[PDB]
Amino acid sequence: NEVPDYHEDIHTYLREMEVKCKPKVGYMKKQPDITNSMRAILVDWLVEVGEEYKLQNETLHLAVNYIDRFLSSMSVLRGKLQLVGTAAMLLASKFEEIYPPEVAEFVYITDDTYTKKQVLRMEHLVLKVLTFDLAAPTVNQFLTQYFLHQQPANCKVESLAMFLGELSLIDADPYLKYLPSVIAGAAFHLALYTVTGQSWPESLIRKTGYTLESLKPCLMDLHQTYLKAPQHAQQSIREKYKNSKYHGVSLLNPPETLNL
Amino acid sequence: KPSACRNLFGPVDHEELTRDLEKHEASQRKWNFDFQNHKPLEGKYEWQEV
Amino acid sequence: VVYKARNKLTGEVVALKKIRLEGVPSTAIREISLLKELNHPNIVKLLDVIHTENKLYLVFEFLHQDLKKFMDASALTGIPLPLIKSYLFQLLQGLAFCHSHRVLHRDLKPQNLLINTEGAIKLADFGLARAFGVPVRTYTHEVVTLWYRAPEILLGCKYYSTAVDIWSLGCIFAEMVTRRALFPGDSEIDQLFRIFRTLGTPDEVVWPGVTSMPDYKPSFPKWARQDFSKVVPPLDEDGRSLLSQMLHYDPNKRISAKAALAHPFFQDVTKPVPHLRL
């Protein structure tokens, strides 16, 4: 599944695009009704939806990107927030999935809050606001590249890194401050360190230009998120990563301290 | 029935919601073409059909 | 395509495509979102997108016709080698750009390659394209128009990537030289057997892992590999070398588009106009 001839070109390109596809950090302050707490409720629900329809993790990450960019431009009352999230998941599914769920399934999974026509109209509106720019880089896209630098491959490290990257989607404060490549870096180091005691490899310094020093602010945040995860109001990601499919990594004990 | 099947923030006014969405010329000026109607317009683009 | 138009002030010509509106088709979602990121002289340019309540309009740069029609028009006349060489060189540039921007085209065939009177050729029709990841995940199976479909797809590989487009381009290269499809199969198994009869039935030596592929069968007849001088007789030594590298069985050994740009076959490449009036 490797594409050795284009790996570097693609990484460089994703590094260009993640700056262009970044949502506005302070957008929630400009929303009259919705809040970070409501956004967290929404994203946690999308995790469940992804589990119910067996969607890719990439699809979830894309949907969250679309939502944050949409809300960066458009004011939305709380009663319509789930409609935005539903259309984003529909769009991300069409883009990313081999078998996207039908619109009727998305309507159903909102417990029939909206109609089919409303979901389709919202899809239209999201596309207009995003100007059809859907091919966004995600934390997931960076993580899978970073995983190739494992010495050697460790599936527990990969699962834990994915878990930590997903946790970042829930909390706009602080994670909107960081680029996906940076969150991916922090997640990979934290997962690697938790499971093996090893650190961010020199080969990734060469590839990304990031060091433990540059990753530190994000790492400090992500370590706190990890430590407090069992107490978080939103638990769908923890439940998801208890699965043996993900080697039950959400059950691992985070290290009390890092060694930076 | 599945746990994922849930309403997050209450019932909505469908008439009002449909109204707000139904709401949503600059391109017509750029291309001198009427897209809603599928009709060419006189302009600097000469719309020969197929 | 239902409308075209020349601009008076510039002389530039555009084409108007329409899509009637499960909401917006996933093929349209991908085509538009990917084309917006693919600005290259050898990729058809998407100029604008216009959404209406039940219709989606795409404005493209206009190109005169496609390579299939051109080859059919030249069915009894040789396409001059300099033009074949120029077209292949340009197609490799367009494809390398796609791959470097994490896009697989997945439907390279002469009907999807557009040409103009100036000697340009451009990749078109990205409706079947997809943005890939590194490393790749399993994607949609049985992709690519049958005659141009790579053996890893035919054998049901869990993973495929950029090599599938290079395979198609190798088939198109051969087809330009003869104006006849290289592997004109009537079904998936017939397609596979036409490839085997030409390139030999692959074994573990030629393609490690091949006998473990989901749709490999030990009952496959075992055909010998024939010389490329017999596969495409008019092609010279450099041309045969390049073609053989684009049609390597093992996707990991198959030449990349950007590596192919430096092949000796292109040492004397130019940009001639077409030999027939468009």
Author numbering:
A (entry chain B): 173 to 432
B (entry chain C): 25 to 48, 54 to 79
C (entry chain A): 17 to 37, 42 to 298
Task: Quote from the publication.
Phosphorylation of Y88 by BCR-ABL was previously shown to partially relieve p27-dependent inhibition of Cdk2/cyclin A, triggering p27 ubiquitination and degradation, and full activation of Cdk2 to drive progression into S phase of the cell division cycle. Upon Y88 phosphorylation, the region 83–89 is ejected from the ATP-binding pocket of Cdk2, resulting in partial Cdk2 activation. Next, we showed that the biochemical effect of this phosphorylation-dependent displacement could be mimicked by deletion of residues 80–94 from p27-KID (p27-KID-ΔC). In order to further illuminate the mechanism of pY88-dependent partial activation of Cdk2, we determined the crystal structure of the p27-KID-ΔC/Cdk2/cyclin A complex. Despite accessibility of the active site to ATP, only 20% of full kinase activity was regained because p27-KID-ΔC altered the structure of Cdk2 near the active site. In particular, residues 74–79 of p27-KID-ΔC formed an inter-molecular β-strand with β-strand 2 (β2) of Cdk2, displacing the β1 strand that otherwise forms the G-loop that binds the phosphates of ATP. The structural results for p27-KID-ΔC bound to Cdk2/cyclin A, which mimics the pY88 state as regards Cdk2 activation and show a cyclin A conformation that is essentially identical to that observed within the p27-KID/Cdk2/cyclin A complex, suggest that such changes would have to involve the C-terminal intrinsically disordered region (IDR) of p27.
However, this basal level of control can often be modulated, or switched, through post-translational modifications to achieve complex regulatory behavior, as exemplified by the cell-cycle regulator, p27Kip1 (p27), which folds upon binding to cyclin-dependent kinase (Cdk)/cyclin complexes that control cell division. The basal function of p27 is the inhibition of the kinase activity of Cdk/cyclin complexes, which can be relieved through phosphorylation of its tyrosine residue(s) by non-receptor tyrosine kinases (NRTKs). p27 is tethered to the Cdk2/cyclin A assembly via two discontinuous subdomains, D1 and D2, within its kinase inhibitory domain (KID); D1 binds to a hydrophobic surface patch on cyclin A and D2 binds to the active site of Cdk2 (for subdomain nomenclature, for the structure of the assembly). Tyrosine 88, located within D2 subdomain, is inserted into the ATP-binding pocket of Cdk2.
